[PDB]
């Protein structure tokens, strides 16, 4: 029942995945799963301890299905959603360069991962985007990194300060 590597929650998902036999169904589930359980913007933290492992087991299924459904050219250049990988990449890099501030940038980069992380997008384009997007994100973030005082920064991040303690 309870376990770190093996538990009821994980077994639950293994079965749900064994029931996906369509590239479209499975691919859709993965993108949804990523929206619901990954990144600081996840819809909920209920699977915080198993999402990483579960997501991989899900990618496995989308990968096998995609390989059997796509032809060679498509497997190399199309996303599991039928989109043209290069178009998506170039498109997302376009918006990233049209980013006005570090807050808009992080949204583009993080959303890109939730939507196109392999086996959705082909790794070649993905990691290529990963390099272009990440570079811009940092340029914006590390510029005058310490100017905004913590009091203000906490407000920009929009966190809920639950407690503060400081003898100095």
């Amino acid at each position: 029942k309870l376990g770190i590597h093996s538990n009821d929650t994980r077994d639950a998902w293994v079965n749900k995945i064994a029931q996906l036999n369509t590239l479209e169904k499975a691919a859709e589930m993965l993108k949804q799963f990523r929206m619901d359980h990954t990144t600081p913007f996840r819809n909920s933290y209920e699977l915080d301890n198993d999402y990483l492992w579960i997501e991989a087991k899900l990618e496995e299924k989308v990968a096998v299905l995609k390989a059997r459904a796509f032809n060679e050219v498509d497997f190399r250049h199309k996303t599991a959603f039928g989109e043209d990988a290069k178009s998506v990449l170039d498109g997302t890099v376009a918006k990233m360069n049209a980013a006005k501030d570090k807050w808009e940038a992080e949204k583009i980069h993080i959303g890109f991962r939730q939507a196109y992380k392999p086996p959705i997008m082909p790794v070649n384009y993905f990691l290529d985007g990963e390099r272009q997007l990440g570079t811009r994100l940092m340029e914006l973030r590390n510029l005058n990194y310490y100017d905004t005082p913590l009091e203000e920064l906490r407000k920009q991040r929009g966190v809920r300060v639950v407690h503060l303690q400081s003898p100095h």
């Binding site: 600081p40 996840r42 933290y45 915080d48 997007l133 590390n142 510029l143 920064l153 809920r160």
Partner: protein, 510 residues
């Protein structure tokens, strides 16, 4: 017809020209900097010659180990406290050596000048040499030592405890995750230059003082390879000194790198040295000040000033929080002793005198607590007592810093006692200092590491230990122990009876 040949430098002379220009000849990794594609490496080496100088070093090392040292039974005549300490020191360093492999491979990709790529490449292979050397130390102590457990399975038993998490931050992820240049500062400009190089020698001193001649033999060999990793970290700053982005980003990444590293080693190395040994070499306070403040923060950082490099802004903070950091941490490490893969011991009297002598105020705080604990029978398996219980009873919660992973107890600490708790999108986060807090606020998606309390929540202690194989060959006795004697070792059962169940200390702010 005179006998002639060709050496390394005679070929290296043309290595810079090996790389050629073309369209996509650029880094595959995100970076805010631009490494001059004309940078030069300090050591004119080629694969053949590199192999030869490393092989000569191996002969001595392994020769001493397989021969004289084995005949002298050096794997045994070591102080028990140290045999345990080396389980942590060697395996924890092993991953630093190992992630440095991937890290310098990433830098070799980042470099554009053929000579700078080659410089990093030499380290790529060194780090493999060091991963295997550190591995050999545990291998040797397992095969010939007084207690193989831990030495023989740290690669998996280390996952049970909280000290490992913090280790992965400064020597694993801090080495490969982020801007290539940021990682380089973590690994080379700070990690190796400030801590690793001086540390490796320090460890050999403490080892020798406690009967351990194995580590000196291996680590002094690893040490000979470090002057190359310094030149690489130095040449990283040169390659980017003329880029305009450098005057904007360099010092920020350097400051974050400095803090990241010191946050973990300042309290961990001092703890391992002073508490994991019987014979002392020198007070950690004095050691730290020389390494971090003088030699690095002053001498090494001063020479890079002509490249726009300045002293880390968090230097004073680091210094002021440092004084008691290691003493504050051992309390937590010992209190959570069942979560380790090594046996810990409480300070004997001679040691307590030494501590008070070198750290005035030590006895009234830590000293008395340890005596209180020993009195309740923390060392005896029939006492049904574990220091963790003492923390609960006296309302002293222990938190895990969301960023550095360093365990901290603000209600009892003598060093830093700050605590910042935030909630963001349905999750609570705990911070121990202002620098780590800024890092998270600005880069929340870089730090989502689950802490032990989160993962072990609602779990009974003995079950987590058994699940993660924290037992000896008898499947009965624990690897970890609250004393280093040969009798009365705690068994899984002794832990189960305590009926200790983990709680997420943050849920209380609810």
């Amino acid at each position: 017809r005179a006998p002639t040949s060709v050496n390394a430098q005679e070929v290296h002379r043309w290595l810079q020209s090996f790389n050629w220009d073309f369209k996509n000849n650029r880094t595959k990794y995100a970076t805010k900097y631009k490494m001059a594609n004309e940078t030069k490496e300090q050591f004119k080496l080629i694969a053949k010659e590199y192999a030869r100088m490393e092989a000569v070093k191996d002969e001595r090392q392994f020769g001493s180990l397989q021969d004289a040292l084995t005949r002298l039974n050096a794997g045994v005549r070591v102080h028990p406290k140290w045999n345990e300490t080396m389980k942590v020191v060697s395996n924890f360093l092993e991953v630093g050596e190992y992630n440095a492999i991937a890290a310098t491979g990433m830098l070799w990709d980042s470099a554009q000048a053929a000579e700078q790529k080659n410089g990093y490449l030499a380290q790529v292979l060194d780090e493999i040499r060091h991963t295997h050397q550190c591995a050999y130390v545990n291998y040797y102590f397992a095969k010939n030592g007084q207690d193989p457990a831990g030495h023989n399975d740290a690669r998996r038993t280390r996952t049970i405890g909280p000290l490992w998490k913090g280790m992965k931050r400064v020597f694993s992820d801090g080495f490969i995750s982020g801007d290539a240049v940021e990682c380089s500062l973590n690994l080379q400009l700070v990690g190796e230059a400030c801590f690793t190089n001086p540390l490796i020698v320090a460890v050999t001193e403490w080892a020798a003082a406690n009967g351990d001649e194995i580590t000196p033999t291996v680590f002094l060999s690893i040490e000979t390879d470090e002057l190359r990793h310094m030149a690489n970290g130095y040449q990283t700053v040169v390659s980017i000194a003329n880029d305009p982005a450098s005057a904007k980003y360099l010092n920020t990444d350097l400051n974050n790198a400095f803090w990241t590293q010191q946050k973990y080693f300042t309290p961990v190395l001092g703890m391992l040295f002073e508490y994991g040994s019987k014979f002392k070499v020198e007070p950690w306070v004095k050691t730290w000040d020389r390494w971090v403040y003088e030699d690095w923060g002053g001498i090494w950082i001063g020479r890079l000033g002509k490249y726009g490099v300045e002293s880390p802004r968090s230097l004073k903070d680091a210094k002021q929080d440092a004084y008691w950091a290691h003493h504050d941490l051992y309390l937590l490490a010992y209190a959570l002793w069942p979560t380790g893969f090594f046996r810990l011991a409480l300070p004997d009297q001679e040691e307590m005198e030494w501590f008070e002598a070198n750290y005035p105020g030590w006895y009234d705080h830590y000293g008395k607590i340890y005596e209180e604990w020993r009195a309740r029978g923390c060392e005896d398996p029939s006492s049904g007592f574990i220091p963790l219980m003492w923390f609960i009873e006296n309302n002293h919660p222990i938190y895990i810093d969301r960023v550095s992973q360093v365990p901290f107890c603000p209600s009892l600490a003598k060093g830093a006692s700050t605590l910042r708790v935030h909630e963001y999108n349905g999750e609570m986060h705990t911070f121990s200092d202002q620098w780590g807090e800024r890092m998270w606020l600005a880069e929340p998606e870089r730090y989502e590491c689950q802490n032990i309390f989160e993962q072990y929540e609602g779990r009974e202690l003995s079950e987590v230990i058994a699940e993660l194989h924290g037992l000896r060959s008898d499947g009965k006795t624990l690897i970890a122990q609250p004393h280093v004697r040969g009798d009365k070792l705690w068994t899984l059962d002794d832990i189960k009876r305590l009926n200790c169940v983990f709680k997420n200390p943050v849920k209380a702010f609810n």
